Amino acid sequence: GTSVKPIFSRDMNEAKRRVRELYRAWYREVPNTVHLFQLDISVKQGRDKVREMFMKNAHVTDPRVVDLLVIKGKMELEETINVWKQRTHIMRFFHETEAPRPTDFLSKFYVGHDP
Amino acid sequence: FAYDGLKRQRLTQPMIRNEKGLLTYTTWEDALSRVAGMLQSFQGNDVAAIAGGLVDAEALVALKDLLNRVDSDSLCTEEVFPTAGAGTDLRSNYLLNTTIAGVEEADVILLVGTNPRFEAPLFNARIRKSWLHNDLKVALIGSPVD
Amino acid sequence: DTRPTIRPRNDVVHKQLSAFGQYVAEILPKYVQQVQVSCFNELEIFIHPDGVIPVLTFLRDHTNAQFKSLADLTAVDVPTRQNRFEIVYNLLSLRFNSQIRVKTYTDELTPIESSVTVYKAANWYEREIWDMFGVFFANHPDLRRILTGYGFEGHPFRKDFPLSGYVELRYDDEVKRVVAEPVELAQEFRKFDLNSPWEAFPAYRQPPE
Amino acid sequence: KLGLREIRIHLCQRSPGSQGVRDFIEKRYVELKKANPDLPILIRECSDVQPKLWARYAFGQEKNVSLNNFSADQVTRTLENVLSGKA
Amino acid sequence: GVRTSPTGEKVTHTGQAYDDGDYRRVRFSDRQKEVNENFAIDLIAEQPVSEVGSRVISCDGGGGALGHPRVYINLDKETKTGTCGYCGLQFRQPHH
Amino acid sequence: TQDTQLIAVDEKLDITTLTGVPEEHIKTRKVRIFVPARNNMQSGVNNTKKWKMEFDTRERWENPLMGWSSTADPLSNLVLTFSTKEDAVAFAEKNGWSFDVEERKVPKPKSKSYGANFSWNKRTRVSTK
Amino acid sequence: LHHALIPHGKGGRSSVSGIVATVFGATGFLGRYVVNHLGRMGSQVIVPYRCEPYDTMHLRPMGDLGQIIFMEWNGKDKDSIRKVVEHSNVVINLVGREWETKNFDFEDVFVKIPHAIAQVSKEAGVEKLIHISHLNADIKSPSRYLRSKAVGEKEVRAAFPEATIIKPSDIFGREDRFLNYFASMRWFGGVPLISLGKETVKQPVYIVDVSKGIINAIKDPDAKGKTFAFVGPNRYLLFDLVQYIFAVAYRPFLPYPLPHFAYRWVGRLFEVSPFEPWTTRDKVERVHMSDMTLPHLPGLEDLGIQATPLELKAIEVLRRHRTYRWLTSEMEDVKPAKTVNI
């Protein structure tokens, strides 16, 4: 039962393939989305935001899912290009308001019963 | 009928003694600093522990590890169990080996120094069921309790 | 049916859908797994995933079936079943005033080629399924998040998605803009355990599986 | 302290690998204990687990050795060397 | 009978009385707490006890359909005037 | 039986990245199963037949106002349903989640004999019905 | 902690942090941001308001249900303070008027009320108090801004033994009347500043860095008594502000080194309008005066709060002044001002 239907990625390379131009478009996308949307964010930290998003999920090996984030990431890009998304939506990725969650067991302990 | 005990006299804050030796509400830093300071300059037999009765094994592992890294391996308990012989050595010496689910077919039970009616009510319930059905013959040494 | 409490049954059409169900079953036995009708004169014929094109193309074009009115494109999550997502079609015949209903099974990833050709009504429904349940459909003209919020995360009608959600919103002065903080409810949803532990209906009871 | 405090074994009731230690604590267990009216060996017998050894030396020094399929005559050799250096 | 706390804070029939150290008392200045002065405990206490010579008395509570379900009241306890759980109206058995 | 360029997926399915749950809510959330014990006051049994996905309980602080139990645990109110434990774990592993197991509480054989309740040399005689 | 004062929650809106921060005069700039920070993790911030409730209405959204408890108060009334800080476990002073009012002599706004709220708070039974001084607080300076600040600073220091006094530098923010001010010479005239700016070095600080300072000072127990100074990341010679601000707004640069003599006249004429003294005689020498280093008192950097550069965020306040043709211009098109600093 290991053999199942693929979406677009017949192999790993095609999954690697689709990630490529997805970043090609998105890397070409950061400077202007800031420019039109009047975001007070420099281009540089916009670009590597896409970078660490890209390997915040670049750990799974199943070829059926990796291209599903490709189309999901593909269309999260489409919604941004044509001023559908607003200032709150672009900034929403740039997490601002919440304090950093605890790092050491000392900080987990001092906040509360939460782990 | 023990949930109401949870609400009465419940410790909620790090409780330390003030300059008058009166227990007072303080943050975690003071309580942590108080214990940490007096344990650094004390090793070996200078540190020990007294195990309670209702503390999980997870804290037991932590307190064994905490004392042994200080080389304070004197992890003492409350219920005194004779160390002479193989008490702590062999698990058989401190186990209900036959298991409560197994005591059914036993012909005779020699209870030694026990009042299971109150000492362990669930244990006494299982004997009574086996007493009524399996014709179990119990035998208690000591007080002629009910 | 002298008693007025229960609704009367209607047998003449009840046999008619079953006859039509076998009629559809014999024509295309490659894709019909099983067909059955319920008490309330509602027939359902069950199709295989890759069968969205011809079965509807059948019902849309057959001279003796001609079911063209696309009713609804629903999905029903069943976590127990491996293919938890169950895409459900529904067609109405104008001339024969009947309601066919075909449903398939699909995993989270496995696609369905878009049935916008047989019914362009499905196109706008198709957007909702990937928004509402999240099942992607193959070769769809424009399959968009159309009903949920912009840049939402996940699929809310997956039964693993909290009713309250994951992100709450508020207007923040220090940014002069709406910021999406994680949810922090004023009151917790007081779930109610509403399941009588006695047998409800001996009829529909599941035997020891 | 270089001396061992708790010498912890972990054997199974049915494992053939644990059979060697099973024979060990069947005949030479009492001899091991009477030679040590002191720091004991911790049996903590279990099921379907490969026979395992922990040495709880003093001042937080622990280390393990594997005893799967290890005969009774020479599991005593194994515990001999670790307890050989204790003073 | 509404009772006041040391800081002039009148208590409710449930017994809630925020102490001075409670920070949650600041919503109370410049404004007021609404207190149901008709304390539900003592507008039932003054109500008398009716005398019915039967072992079981119905307790519809008047108003016919406008009331509480007619739970039947057992009346044989000489030391305890049988009251209804719904309405609390104490019923009594003539002193033999 | 389904031959259309099928990919031989030998790795266990991990759909965790699609559902987009927060990262603190996929690792720091012990997920557990069991078949509910019957409510001892209710002799009915038609509830101990399904496995469920329930989570660990986080803190419940009282509201500064009237006193609702304000919570920030979105996953707490997520009692799922499962026909069999094999399907239960299948959901658990498919979106890989730190999980534990539990065995179905199975009844034992109640050897009942109403004729036993009355006897001559047997002690199971009952004094009052 | 008190039975209900004990904290609880994940820092959400409906999470009790156990800090009851009654802030004084929050209806402007720093008050708006601190309550925003105060209400973020949840706290009973009792704000005594004195103006029309309409102008205080915009503080409501940054608080959970029953959190932003506006309370009527008056500066002269002794009992007015005692009612608003009676149950507040912490008191954050923010009173003070950067401009002048006939009824409010400049001594009062930094001596009378700050002393008039510090002693009541200590009599009520509070734990902490934070009165906001100025980084340049100095009575001997010709600045009545500085003259009133310093004497009041030590009064609350003397009155309150645990008075954690904060001395921030020239804060900047959306309504700082410092950046939007320095954009306003183009509207007013030909930049009548003194000596073309080559006589004054200042160290602006972004307000959120300041506001995060107090709340971090709230959780810090050792902050009592210690007099923390909130200083920006880099200093800036006065001329660099003028050209940079006129650059990040695309304004016609018309600098003019008007000496102090005639620039003092325009101060009173700006106070002439009996609705708001746009610029005061105090504000004449206020900008001419430079900021002393003040290195001995601890700063926010050791308190866990870093400092955000001014040039990092300018159009966030200055895009409003940018004309339609250049409203879209960000920092990158504009050169950074010369960082005349340490």
Ligand SMILES: NC(=O)C1=CN([C@@H]2O[C@H](COP(=O)(O)OP(=O)(O)OC[C@H]3O[C@@H](n4cnc5c(N)ncnc54)[C@H](OP(=O)(O)O)[C@@H]3O)[C@@H](O)[C@H]2O)C=CC1
């Ligand atoms: N760069 C700067 O501007 C710096 C300023 N400071 C000081 O910080 C304090 C607050 O600054 P900021 O928030 O920007 O100022 P704002 O002018 O924006 O707000 C000042 C606040 O003080 C209140 N207030 C002042 N005097 C009285 C009074 N007599 N009675 C009642 N309320 C009064 C006001 O209430 P209302 O609006 O109702 O009048 C208002 O809420 C001031 O003392 C300021 O000088 C310190 C360091 C740097």
Ligand SMILES: [Zn+2]
């Ligand atoms: Zn009644």
